[PDB]
From a paper:
Aminoacyl-[name] synthetases (AARSs) play a crucial role in the translation of genetic information by attaching specific amino acids to their corresponding transfer RNA ([name]) molecules. [name] ([name]) often misactivates Gly or Ser instead of its cognate amino acid, Ala. To get structural explanation why the [name] mutation prevents [name] from misactivating Ser to produce seryl-adenylate, we determined the crystal structures of both the wild-type and [name] mutant [name] proteins in complex with ATP and Ala. AlaRS429 and AlaRS429L219M consist of the N-terminal nine-stranded β-sheet structure harboring the catalytic site (residues 1–241) and the C-terminal α-helix bundle (residues 242–429) responsible for [name] recognition.
Here we show a groundbreaking discovery where a single-point mutation, [name], in [name] from [name], effectively eliminates Ser misactivation. Hereafter, the structure of AlaRS429L219M was employed to describe the binding modes of ATP and Ala since electron density for Ala was clearer in this structure. The presence of ATP and Ala in their intact forms indicates that this structure depicts the conformational state before activation. When the structure of AlaRS429L219M is superposed onto those of E. coli [name], it was obvious that AlaRS429L219M resembles the open structure of the apo state rather than the closed structure depicting the conformational state after aminoacylation. First, the adenine base is stacked between Phe89 in motif 2 and Arg232 in motif 3, which anchors ATP in the active site. The α-NH3+ group of Ala interacts with the α-phosphate group of ATP and its methyl side chain forms hydrophobic contact with Val204. The distance between the methyl side chain of Ala and Val204 is 3.4 Å, which suggests that if Ser were positioned in the same space, the extra hydroxyl group of Ser would clash with Val204. Interestingly, the B-values of Cα atoms of Val204 in AlaRS429 and AlaRS429L219M are 19.96 and 26.68 Å2, respectively, suggesting that Val204 is more flexible in AlaRS429L219M than in AlaRS429. That is, the more dynamic Val204 of AlaRS429L219M invades the space intended for the extra hydroxyl group of Ser, whereas the relatively static Val204 in AlaRS429 allows the binding of Ser without inducing clash with the hydroxyl group. Structural analyses of the pre-reaction state revealed that the [name] mutation increases the flexibility of Val204. This enhanced flexibility enables Val204 to function as a “molecular discriminator,” selectively blocking the binding of Ser to the active site of AlaRS429L219M while still permitting the accommodation of Ala.
Numbering used by the authors:
A (entry chain A): 1 to 70, 74 to 425
B (entry chain B): 1 to 71, 74 to 425
Write the structure that this text describes.
Amino acid sequence: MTSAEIRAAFLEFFRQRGHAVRPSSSLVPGNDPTLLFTNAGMVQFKDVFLGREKVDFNRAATSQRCVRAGNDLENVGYTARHHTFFEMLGNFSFGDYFKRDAINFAWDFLTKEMGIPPAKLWVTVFDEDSEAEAIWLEEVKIDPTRFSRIGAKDNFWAMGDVGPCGPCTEIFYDHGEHVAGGPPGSPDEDGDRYIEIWNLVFMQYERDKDGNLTPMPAPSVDTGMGLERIAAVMQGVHSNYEIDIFQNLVKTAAALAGTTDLSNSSLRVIADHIRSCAFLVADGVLPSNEGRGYVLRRIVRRAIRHGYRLGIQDTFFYKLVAPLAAEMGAAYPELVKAQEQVERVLKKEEERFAETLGQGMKILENCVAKLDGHVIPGDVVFLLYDTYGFPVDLTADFAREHNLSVDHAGFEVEMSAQRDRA
Amino acid sequence: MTSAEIRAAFLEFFRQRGHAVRPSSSLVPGNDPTLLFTNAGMVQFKDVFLGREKVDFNRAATSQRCVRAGGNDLENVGYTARHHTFFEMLGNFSFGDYFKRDAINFAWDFLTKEMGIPPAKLWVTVFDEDSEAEAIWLEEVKIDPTRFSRIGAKDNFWAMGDVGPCGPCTEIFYDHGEHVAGGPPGSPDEDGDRYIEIWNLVFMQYERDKDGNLTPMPAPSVDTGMGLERIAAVMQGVHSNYEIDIFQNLVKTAAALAGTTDLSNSSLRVIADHIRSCAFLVADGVLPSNEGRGYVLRRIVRRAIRHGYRLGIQDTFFYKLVAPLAAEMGAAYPELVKAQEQVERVLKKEEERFAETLGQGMKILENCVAKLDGHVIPGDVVFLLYDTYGFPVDLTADFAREHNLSVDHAGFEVEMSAQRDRA
Ligand SMILES: Nc1ncnc2c1ncn2[C@@H]1O[C@H](COP(=O)(O)OP(=O)(O)OP(=O)(O)O)[C@@H](O)[C@H]1O
Ligand SMILES: Nc1ncnc2c1ncn2[C@@H]1O[C@H](COP(=O)(O)OP(=O)(O)OP(=O)(O)O)[C@@H](O)[C@H]1O
Ligand SMILES: Nc1ncnc2c1ncn2[C@@H]1O[C@H](COP(=O)(O)OP(=O)(O)OP(=O)(O)O)[C@@H](O)[C@H]1O
């Protein structure tokens, strides 16, 4: 089942159950200036959940474009499950149904619409949420040995210091004994064997300025399921980067690098980064040294640095815009409309960074050759930031590849000294 | 080697190196209203480290009484071999004097030369962005590099606060051997009692200002801390802190009061831990109450009493453990001996007060657990036991933990908001 088929099947399943199918919001949130990028299907409905905005539907469903880079940027290429850019499939209840319907909707979709066998699924609840435990174990009657009760850090949510909060229940997919890791709640739960597929958030209480808890007047539901993780389940593959919607991207990156080794991790990094960078440019973000524009700059330049690692000879990053648009333009026409703008923007940024990347890498490679210890010193980090346009995390990501770190504190001291020279 | 011998040797080792040996401060901190109880040897020297207070010594050493029951290790007592509410922290301090090289050499010398601990039983970690500390350990001291880990800022970077001094830390661990569960620092099961953190060295190296800018600290400083009970267990060949010499008379007396012969029973160890924090807190001026420091004391007292109930003790018992505590540690802490009768009176009265509702409250709890479907004691039971029977939520939750149950905190909080409205 292709990713587009799964996205549509998800949305059709909830439309049939009376959910208003709504479009994704932009990656640049409007109703939330403090937030860098849209990181969940929840964001555009935040004011509805708060009761500050009225809409004429009390149940919705979306496929939401999200970026988590300000944070999953350092997991890209190192795990089978993390992206900067991903799509979150969500259903929402605005004071309509609550735990019982949300749980059955999700279990029905996974085990009946999608046909996933219950023996491959694992469920967690908040260890203080007896309603969700009772619904799962006594009503749905799931296998209790593939079940865990988890503390507040993973299974309790709050919109902020004030406002709605409540327990969460989560559904995981067991990729089997060939992948390293243990079930949720075990010491190696972080492994890629048991992948979190679907997160169900139950908005159940209100916390006020003084810290008091009260019942939420209209208990609400917000869920989110990563499209790529469920696509990997439905296509029988272990890694997100093996699904249909990444193949053209990885194949094109490979073609530009002149290699047939489709297992090279820099290809996956480049494939991930073009998705976040292209979609961000199409939502209006432009490279700069501040705010949202610097996050984009940081991600572009890191993709370029990985092309350097692969030995790519000519400006390349902008060339992945077209296969992305061909692959996702049906679902995201704003990509097709802005294709030319996105290509120009990415090309210019790569050309601008190329005037210092080669020299900066020579300094980096020389430093790695002569270094004693495992820490790149702060003055070198600052030299690369200040003269050669290397963001600190770009330098740190290169250092990671040679079992090295970078002196963040030493870099910060260099920055204060520079303010002192001004 | 007894705990008192280790305490004295530690202080004498640093006194020879020109450290002024200073007394422990109180568990109730001065010039620091935000902090609940003194929780580290640093607390009394904080203003010296900040340059706000002048003293006529630039290096010191103390054995500091500490309590960690807030802001917090109360829920680890009895469940790990290594955690207390009350413990003594052995520290040496440099006030802009020596720095990383001497601190590391002082620490290694004391463990491997004074105390004779084999290097094959020690494990060292550094901040993974601290090349100076790595170089000193690996190139100068020349420790075995396979018993060494480079750890990120969560475990090995320290800061006094959002502004003020900060810097990297290096830590020394002891390997209790293959019969204990756990892995080395940095491994997935680094938690667990096999590799126990013995000594923490804090290097005050930078200053962070209001806006988050770092500058070099004008006079780099050192603050260290090593738990007396953990090193005593190493030096006495035992796995659990509670098996060391300084806990034996306490656990033995508690066992006699409970009529049991199992000197390792975990509720005995909890009772032995709690009398140390409760007695020393009362001796430092704290009194049971429903607010602030007095409520933390009340909570620890009542949890000890509830554990006596679990062991079947029928007659008020908790205050009877002050006398063996004072006998065991009175040489080191004479204020305990002077305040002994007052401590016993306060602890006795508090138990008699809780006893007016403890039995009835437990019947409600035991009946609730017998008929309970699910794993969560509901919020209205939690609020009833709190509001009518004086059961702190963590007391009720600690009972529930023993039956693999949890407690509805959110539901309890909702009940509390409703009660405030009835006012
Ligand atoms: N960076 C990412 N890359 C790929 N998929 C992701 C990423 N972040 C989240 N997902 C997917 O989206 C789903 C919903 O994410 P969401 O943030 O709501 O859950 P979560 O991270 O468990 O939340 P919480 O941290 O509040 O417990 C996840 O279950 C996962 O399938
Ligand atoms: N056609 C392909 N052949 C090989 N690797 C690919 C291909 N397409 C993508 N990759 C990426 O290369 C990564 C590493 O593959 P590797 O050969 O090291 O392990 P593998 O046998 O594919 O195991 P797994 O499927 O669990 O990753 C994969 O996880 C995947 O993201
Ligand atoms: N609750 C406790 N019970 C017994 N010993 C303790 C307790 N807390 C700390 N110690 C001992 O005191 C030493 C110093 O404590 P300290 O808090 O400085 O180290 P830490 O816990 O690593 O702190 P940080 O994580 O802030 O660096 C520890 O190495 C440990 O041996």
